[PDB]
C-alpha cells in the first residue's frame, strides 16, 4: 500500500507516498483536538538544544487515550480510522456505548465497525486492552505500560509489537522491538495486537523540501567545518577528521546508558 | 491374511489405543508392512491412527 509516483519531474524520480487506503473521514473530531506550536528545537532558555528542527507544517494534537483504565466492560465501536501527523501510526475513533468518544492507536486488522472490549474479561482479539495477567504467553501485544496505571509507553510506532514471553509470579517478561528482554509488572495493561500502518518505512521521500515539510532542517557534517566549531573540523583539503569519531561537544562514541541506573534489575538482556 | 480386509467394518480409530498396541513395536515405532500382513490401504490407515494418537498422547513417540 505504498504508491510510487511516475518520474515526471527530477524530484519525483524515485519518490513514494502512502496510499491512504485505510483512512475514512478525512477530518478530525472537534472536541478531541488541542493546539500545538513548533519550537525549532528551543528550550525554556530560548537556545537550540536539539539541532536540526524547525520549519514545518502546522499541526493539531489529537488526544490519544493511552490509559484505558476506567471503561472496563463498556464495549466500544470503531467509528473511523483517521490520519495523525504527530505519530507514524493511524488513529481510531471509538464510540463507546455510554457516550464518550476516544482515540486509540489502530491495531493491524481493525477495520471500521468492529467492537473493542476492555478489562479482565475481554477476548484476545486485536484492539482489546487487558492487564498482562490475563494475556496468554506468546501473544503479540502493543502499547504496554511500565508501571501499573502509568500510561502506555512501549511499542507504539507503526508496525512495532512486543511478544509476551512468560509470567513467573509477579513479573512478566517481554521481548521488545529492539531485542531488549525486559521484565515488567503483571498488573500493567497492554493492547492485544500489532500496530497497523506497517509499510511506512519503505517510503522514499523524494526531494529535499519534502523533509522540510515534516520538520527536518539540514544537517551539516563536522568535517567541513573549522576547528573552533567542531572537533572534526580543519584540514587543508578534505579529511576524515584526524581523530576518533566524536560528537560536536567532544564526547567519544560508546555506551551512554547510566552504568548503575535503577532499572538495571528489570533488564534480563541488552539488545544486540 | 490381512485382518482388516477379512473382518469387515472394524474401524481403525485413533481413539482406540488397544488395537494400536499391536502394529507398533516394542520401541514405539510403526511396524513394517511385510511383518503385519496388511494391504496398502489399511497400512495407511494404521499409520495415520498412530500419528494422531501420538499427538493426543495416547501412544509415545519413543520408549525404551
Amino acid at each position: 500500500a505504498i504508491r510510487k509516483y511516475k518520474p515526471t519531474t527530477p524530484g519525483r524520480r524515485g519518490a513514494s507516498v502512502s496510499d491512504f487506503a485505510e483512512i475514512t473521514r478525512s477530518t478530525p473530531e472537534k472536541s478531541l483536538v488541542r493546539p500545538l506550536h513548533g519550537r525549532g528545537g528551543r528550550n525554556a532558555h530560548g537556545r537550540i538544544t536539539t539541532r536540526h528542527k524547525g520549519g514545518g507544517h502546522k499541526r493539531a494534537y489529537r488526544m490519544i487515550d493511552f490509559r484505558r483504565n476506567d471503561k472496563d466492560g463498556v464495549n466500544a465501536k470503531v467509528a473511523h480510522i483517521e490520519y495523525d501527523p504527530n505519530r507514524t501510526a493511524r488513529i481510531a475513533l471509538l464510540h463507546y456505548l455510554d457516550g464518550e468518544k476516544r482515540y486509540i492507536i489502530a491495531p493491524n486488522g481493525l477495520s471500521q465497525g468492529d467492537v473493542v472490549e476492555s478489562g479482565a474479561n475481554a477476548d484476545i482479539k486485536p484492539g482489546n486492552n487487558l492487564p498482562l495477567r490475563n494475556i496468554p504467553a506468546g501473544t503479540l501485544i502493543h502499547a504496554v505500560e511500565l508501571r501499573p496505571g502509568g500510561g502506555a509507553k512501549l511499542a507504539r510506532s507503526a508496525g512495532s509489537s512486543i511478544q509476551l514471553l512468560g509470567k513467573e509470579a509477579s513479573y512478566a517478561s517481554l521481548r521488545m522491538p529492539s531485542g531488549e528482554i525486559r521484565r515488567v509488572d503483571v498488573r500493567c495493561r497492554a493492547t492485544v495486537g500489532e500496530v497497523g500502518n506497517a509499510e511506512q518505512a519503505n517510503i522514499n521521500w523524494g526531494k529535499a523540501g519534502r523533509m522540510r515539510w515534516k520538520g527536518k532542517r539540514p544537517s551539516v557534517r563536522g568535517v567541513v567545518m573549522n576547528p573552533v566549531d567542531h572537533p572534526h573540523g580543519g584540514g587543508e583539503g578534505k579529511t576524515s577528521g584526524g581523530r576518533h569519531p566524536v560528537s560536536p561537544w567532544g564526547k567519544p562514541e560508546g555506551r551512554t546508558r547510566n552504568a548503575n541506573k535503577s532499572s538495571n534489575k528489570f533488564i534480563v538482556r541488552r539488545r544486540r | 491374511k490381512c485382518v482388516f480386509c477379512a473382518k469387515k467394518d472394524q474401524a481403525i480409530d485413533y481413539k482406540d489405543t488397544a488395537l494400536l498396541r499391536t502394529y507398533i513395536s516394542e520401541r514405539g515405532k510403526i511396524r513394517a508392512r511385510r511383518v503385519t500382513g496388511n494391504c496398502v490401504q489399511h497400512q495407511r490407515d494404521i499409520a495415520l491412527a498412530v500419528k494422531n494418537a501420538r499427538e493426543v498422547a495416547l501412544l509415545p513417540f519413543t520408549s525404551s
Binding site: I124, P136 | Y14, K15, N52, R54, V56, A57, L59
Partner: protein, 95 residues
Amino acid sequence: MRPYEIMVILDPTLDERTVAPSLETFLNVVRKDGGKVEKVDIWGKRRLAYEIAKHAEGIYVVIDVKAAPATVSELDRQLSLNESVLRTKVMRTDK
C-alpha cells in the same frame, strides 16, 4: 452441517464437578449459531504418554459436535485460549 469430533485435554487439577458446567459456556457458541451437540462423553483421569506442559495426567473429553464449518473454527479458538485446556484435535468423521 458437517459431522465433527473434537477431543479436548483438560488440566488435571480440576475435579470432575467443574468440567461439564465448564465447557457448557463454550458449547453455547455452537447452539446459538444453529448447530447440534450430540455426545459429551468424559473419560476421566488418564496417564499421559508424555509430559504435556509440566503435567503427566489429564482429563479427556470427547465433544462430538455437528455444526457449520465456521463455528468449529470458532470453538477451538476459544478452547485454546482457556487455561484449563492443554491440547485440541478437531477431526471430521465422514469422507
